[PDB]
Coordinates of C-alpha atoms and ligand atoms in Angstrom, one line a residue:
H1 CA 0.3 0.1 0.5
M2 CA 3.3 2.2 0.1
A3 CA 6.3 2.2 -2.5
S4 CA 9.2 0.0 -3.0
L5 CA 12.8 2.2 -2.6
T6 CA 14.9 -0.9 -2.6
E7 CA 13.4 -1.8 -5.7
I8 CA 12.9 1.3 -7.3
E9 CA 16.5 2.3 -7.0
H10 CA 18.1 -1.3 -8.1
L11 CA 16.3 -0.8 -11.6
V12 CA 17.3 3.3 -11.6
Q13 CA 21.2 1.6 -10.8
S14 CA 20.3 -1.3 -14.3
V15 CA 19.3 1.1 -16.5
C16 CA 22.0 3.6 -16.1
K17 CA 24.5 1.0 -16.1
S18 CA 23.2 -0.3 -19.2
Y19 CA 23.0 3.0 -20.8
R20 CA 26.8 3.7 -19.8
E21 CA 28.1 0.5 -21.3
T22 CA 26.4 1.1 -24.2
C23 CA 27.6 4.7 -25.4
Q24 CA 29.9 5.0 -28.1
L25 CA 32.3 8.1 -26.3
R26 CA 31.5 8.9 -22.8
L27 CA 30.5 12.5 -22.1
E28 CA 34.0 13.1 -20.4
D29 CA 35.8 12.3 -23.9
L30 CA 33.0 15.0 -25.7
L31 CA 33.5 17.7 -23.2
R32 CA 37.5 18.1 -23.4
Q33 CA 36.8 17.5 -27.3
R34 CA 35.0 20.5 -27.5
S35 CA 37.7 23.0 -27.7
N36 CA 39.1 20.9 -31.6
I37 CA 36.8 22.2 -33.7
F38 CA 37.1 21.2 -37.9
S39 CA 39.0 24.1 -39.8
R40 CA 38.1 26.2 -42.8
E41 CA 40.1 23.7 -44.9
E42 CA 39.1 20.6 -43.6
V43 CA 35.1 22.1 -44.2
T44 CA 35.9 22.8 -47.6
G45 CA 36.8 18.6 -47.5
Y46 CA 33.9 17.6 -46.5
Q47 CA 31.5 20.0 -48.5
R48 CA 34.2 18.9 -51.9
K49 CA 33.1 14.8 -50.8
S50 CA 30.3 13.7 -53.5
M51 CA 26.9 13.3 -51.9
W52 CA 27.2 10.6 -51.7
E53 CA 30.6 9.7 -50.5
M54 CA 28.6 12.0 -47.1
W55 CA 25.7 9.8 -47.2
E56 CA 27.8 6.3 -46.4
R57 CA 29.8 8.2 -43.7
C58 CA 26.4 9.4 -42.6
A59 CA 24.3 6.5 -42.9
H60 CA 27.0 4.5 -41.2
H61 CA 27.6 6.6 -37.9
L62 CA 23.3 6.3 -37.8
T63 CA 23.6 2.6 -38.3
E64 CA 26.1 1.5 -36.0
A65 CA 24.3 5.1 -33.5
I66 CA 21.0 2.5 -34.1
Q67 CA 23.0 -1.2 -32.9
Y68 CA 24.5 0.8 -29.7
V69 CA 20.5 2.0 -28.7
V70 CA 19.5 -2.5 -29.7
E71 CA 22.1 -3.3 -27.0
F72 CA 20.9 -1.0 -24.6
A73 CA 17.4 -2.1 -25.0
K74 CA 18.2 -6.2 -24.8
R75 CA 20.0 -5.0 -21.4
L76 CA 16.6 -3.3 -19.7
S77 CA 15.0 -5.8 -17.7
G78 CA 12.2 -7.5 -18.7
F79 CA 12.5 -6.7 -23.2
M80 CA 14.5 -10.3 -23.6
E81 CA 11.6 -11.3 -21.4
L82 CA 9.8 -10.0 -24.1
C83 CA 8.3 -11.7 -27.2
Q84 CA 10.4 -10.9 -30.3
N85 CA 7.0 -9.2 -31.9
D86 CA 6.8 -7.3 -29.7
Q87 CA 11.0 -6.4 -29.5
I88 CA 11.0 -5.8 -33.1
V89 CA 7.5 -3.3 -32.4
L90 CA 9.5 -1.2 -29.4
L91 CA 12.8 -1.2 -31.6
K92 CA 11.5 -0.5 -34.7
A93 CA 9.4 2.3 -33.4
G94 CA 11.7 3.8 -31.0
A95 CA 15.2 3.3 -31.9
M96 CA 16.1 6.8 -34.0
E97 CA 14.2 8.2 -31.2
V98 CA 16.6 7.0 -29.1
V99 CA 18.9 8.1 -31.3
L100 CA 18.3 11.5 -31.6
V101 CA 18.4 11.9 -28.3
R102 CA 21.6 10.8 -28.0
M103 CA 22.9 12.8 -29.8
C104 CA 22.5 16.5 -27.9
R105 CA 25.3 14.7 -26.1
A106 CA 27.7 15.5 -28.7
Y107 CA 26.8 18.4 -29.4
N108 CA 27.1 21.6 -28.4
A109 CA 25.4 24.3 -27.8
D110 CA 27.3 27.8 -26.9
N111 CA 29.5 27.6 -30.4
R112 CA 26.3 25.8 -32.1
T113 CA 28.2 22.4 -33.3
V114 CA 29.1 18.4 -33.1
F115 CA 31.4 16.0 -32.9
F116 CA 31.2 13.6 -36.0
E117 CA 34.2 11.9 -37.2
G118 CA 36.9 13.3 -34.4
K119 CA 36.3 16.7 -34.3
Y120 CA 33.5 19.5 -33.7
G121 CA 31.6 21.6 -37.2
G122 CA 28.5 23.5 -37.8
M123 CA 26.0 22.2 -40.2
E124 CA 27.7 23.2 -42.6
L125 CA 29.8 19.9 -43.2
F126 CA 26.7 18.2 -44.5
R127 CA 26.2 20.8 -46.9
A128 CA 27.0 18.1 -49.8
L129 CA 23.9 16.1 -48.8
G130 CA 22.0 18.6 -49.4
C131 CA 20.2 18.2 -46.4
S132 CA 19.3 21.8 -45.3
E133 CA 16.6 21.5 -43.8
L134 CA 16.3 18.7 -42.3
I135 CA 20.0 19.3 -40.6
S136 CA 18.7 22.1 -38.7
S137 CA 15.8 20.5 -37.9
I138 CA 18.5 18.2 -35.6
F139 CA 20.4 20.9 -34.5
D140 CA 17.6 23.2 -33.2
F141 CA 16.2 19.9 -31.1
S142 CA 19.4 19.4 -29.8
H143 CA 19.8 22.2 -29.0
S144 CA 16.1 22.5 -27.4
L145 CA 17.3 19.8 -25.1
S146 CA 20.3 21.2 -24.3
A147 CA 19.2 24.4 -22.5
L148 CA 17.6 21.5 -20.3
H149 CA 21.1 20.7 -19.4
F150 CA 20.1 16.7 -18.5
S151 CA 22.8 14.4 -16.2
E152 CA 23.6 10.9 -17.9
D153 CA 21.0 9.4 -15.3
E154 CA 18.5 11.6 -17.4
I155 CA 19.4 10.8 -20.6
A156 CA 19.0 7.3 -19.6
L157 CA 16.1 7.0 -17.1
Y158 CA 14.2 9.2 -19.9
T159 CA 15.7 7.0 -23.5
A160 CA 14.5 3.9 -21.6
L161 CA 10.8 5.2 -21.3
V162 CA 11.2 7.0 -24.7
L163 CA 11.7 2.9 -25.9
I164 CA 9.7 1.0 -23.6
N165 CA 6.3 2.0 -24.4
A166 CA 3.0 1.1 -24.1
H167 CA 0.8 2.7 -26.9
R168 CA 2.8 2.0 -30.2
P169 CA 0.7 0.3 -32.7
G170 CA 1.0 -3.7 -33.4
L171 CA 2.2 -4.8 -29.7
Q172 CA 0.4 -8.3 -28.5
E173 CA 1.4 -8.7 -24.5
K174 CA 0.6 -5.6 -23.7
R175 CA -0.2 -5.8 -20.0
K176 CA 3.5 -6.5 -19.9
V177 CA 4.9 -3.9 -21.5
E178 CA 2.8 -0.9 -19.7
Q179 CA 3.9 -2.6 -16.1
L180 CA 7.8 -2.1 -17.6
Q181 CA 6.5 1.6 -18.5
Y182 CA 5.1 2.2 -15.1
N183 CA 8.3 0.3 -13.2
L184 CA 10.5 3.0 -15.4
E185 CA 8.4 5.6 -14.8
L186 CA 8.5 5.2 -10.8
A187 CA 11.9 5.0 -11.7
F188 CA 12.8 7.8 -13.9
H189 CA 10.3 10.0 -11.3
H190 CA 12.0 9.2 -8.4
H191 CA 15.5 10.1 -9.5
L192 CA 14.1 13.6 -10.3
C193 CA 12.5 13.9 -7.3
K194 CA 16.0 12.9 -5.4
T195 CA 17.9 16.0 -7.4
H196 CA 15.4 18.2 -7.0
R197 CA 14.5 18.6 -11.4
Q198 CA 10.6 16.8 -11.0
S199 CA 10.4 20.4 -13.2
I200 CA 12.2 19.5 -16.3
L201 CA 8.9 16.6 -16.5
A202 CA 6.5 19.2 -17.8
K203 CA 9.7 20.3 -19.5
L204 CA 10.3 17.8 -22.1
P205 CA 9.8 17.8 -25.9
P206 CA 6.4 17.7 -27.0
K207 CA 6.1 13.2 -28.0
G208 CA 4.7 14.9 -31.2
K209 CA 7.9 16.8 -31.5
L210 CA 10.5 13.9 -31.5
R211 CA 7.7 11.1 -33.5
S212 CA 7.7 14.1 -36.4
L213 CA 11.0 14.8 -36.1
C214 CA 11.4 11.2 -36.8
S215 CA 9.1 10.5 -39.2
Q216 CA 11.2 12.8 -41.4
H217 CA 14.3 11.5 -40.6
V218 CA 13.9 8.1 -42.0
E219 CA 12.0 9.3 -44.1
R220 CA 15.0 10.7 -45.5
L221 CA 17.8 8.1 -45.0
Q222 CA 15.0 4.8 -46.7
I223 CA 15.2 7.6 -49.7
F224 CA 18.9 7.5 -50.0
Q225 CA 18.9 3.9 -49.6
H226 CA 16.8 3.3 -52.4
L227 CA 18.8 5.1 -54.0
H228 CA 22.9 4.2 -53.0
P229 CA 22.4 1.1 -50.4
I230 CA 24.6 1.0 -48.1
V231 CA 25.9 -3.0 -47.2
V232 CA 25.2 -3.6 -43.0
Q233 CA 25.4 -6.8 -41.0
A234 CA 22.5 -6.7 -38.8
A235 CA 22.7 -7.5 -34.7
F236 CA 18.6 -8.2 -35.1
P237 CA 18.0 -9.8 -38.5
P238 CA 14.3 -9.4 -38.3
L239 CA 14.6 -5.5 -36.8
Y240 CA 16.1 -5.2 -39.7
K241 CA 14.7 -7.6 -42.7
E242 CA 11.7 -5.0 -41.3
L243 CA 13.2 -1.6 -42.9
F244 CA 15.6 -2.5 -45.3
Ligands
79U1 C1 12.4 3.5 -38.5 N1 12.3 4.3 -37.2 C2 11.1 5.0 -36.7 C3 13.3 3.6 -36.7 O1 13.6 4.2 -35.3 C4 14.4 2.6 -36.6 C5 14.8 2.0 -36.0 C6 16.1 1.0 -37.1 C7 16.1 1.3 -37.8 C8 16.4 2.1 -38.6 C9 15.8 3.3 -37.4 C10 17.7 1.9 -38.7 O2 17.2 4.0 -40.2 C11 18.9 3.8 -41.0 C12 20.0 3.8 -41.3 CL1 20.6 3.7 -39.5 C13 20.4 3.6 -42.0 C14 20.5 3.6 -43.0 C15 18.9 3.1 -43.6 C16 17.6 3.5 -42.9 C17 16.4 3.6 -42.3 F1 16.5 3.1 -44.6 F2 15.8 4.6 -42.3 F3 15.8 2.1 -41.9 N2 17.9 1.3 -39.4 N3 17.9 0.6 -38.8 C18 18.4 -0.4 -38.2 C19 19.6 -0.6 -38.2 C20 20.5 -1.9 -38.4 C21 19.7 -2.5 -37.5 C22 20.8 -3.9 -37.0 O3 22.1 -3.8 -37.2 O4 19.8 -5.2 -37.3 C23 18.4 -2.9 -37.4 C24 18.1 -1.5 -37.8

């Protein structure tokens, strides 16, 4: 009739562990390297690469980032304990939204640059892709998320919830997911209360804004994959087979 703290704390620690063990670079690396910016002629060299050459670097970086999120989902309590159809559903709808959220770590809102291939640069680095609106939309959204000053525990718990969402169309075991969700919600709210950050709940990006930016992103990557497929060693082949 009253909440159990030890279980909640165990869940928080476990999510935050899985998150740490499934990030490309640690937040410390990205933050120190902030002063390491692309020179004007390094910029130039990227701008003079062909559309398809930039696409394959970007697509590879993006696919690897989806793989890391797949890994994160497999390590979450109960996810592996859940039917294959449901796992695919959660990941098909969710993994790229998590990737887009993770980006805020690599983004510096001070000079509006991101870390790409060892150094920081603005959106002009990607000019050969001819994806101006989309890239600026991505930058805008990272800039929005930056103004929240997430900790890594916050990103961990929040991206866990972006993924574990019982409203995704086509789930079978819906009640199991609701339960994993509610537990994640108690874990997140607990942690935020501990750190005096509860007031960020109401400031999180509206759900519709994450969805739209993801739809736009994915629509674009699909056209590019049709026009110039990159070749991928699938880590979750039944998920992969549903999109490629
Ligand atoms: C559709 N959507 C809303 C998602 O959240 C979602 C989920 C998984 C995605 C992708 C997107 C996705 O996007 C890509 C990437 Cl990263 C690179 C080239 C093409 C695409 C895609 F065509 F949009 F699917 N790969 N991709 C992916 C990458 C690798 C594996 C694998 O190794 O098993 C599986 C899926």
